[PDB]
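step=predict obj=glutathione peroxidase n=163
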Amino acid sequence: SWNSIYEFTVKDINGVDVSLEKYRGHVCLIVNVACKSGATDKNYRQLQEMHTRLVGKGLRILAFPCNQFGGQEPWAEAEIKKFVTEKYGVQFDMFSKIKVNGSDADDLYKFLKSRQHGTLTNNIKWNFSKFLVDRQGQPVKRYSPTTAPYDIEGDIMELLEKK
């Protein structure tokens, strides 16, 4: 019964309910994030740089805080928002904290994982895994946590050239 990301609603980091219909016709990069990890700086800085350069062409980065990996996203939303804006100047879209694995995972992630399977198992492996979603809301690629955002630029460019 699930067919595209536009059918799902999630709370943004300010506690407001957002239908992902907002993103219709744009290329989305969906990332589970954490503030207290050794990988935090590199992921956030590359994502913010790519956002600045590519938002005009249609890139929409969605960042979902998740505390399931080493307890590395413990803070409340206000504190997460303050941290990422002060440290990285994040201008892309931040969401409220969710689970990405288990039976209480957000429906969005249950959908993403169904459409783009993992290796050995479908669980998100660590902080900062990435899913790429095309201009029709279809998940088309999944990347490991250690895939740098810049390594996804070519795939993003390919989809940004599609109608």
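step=describe
The longest strand covers residues 27-33.
step=end
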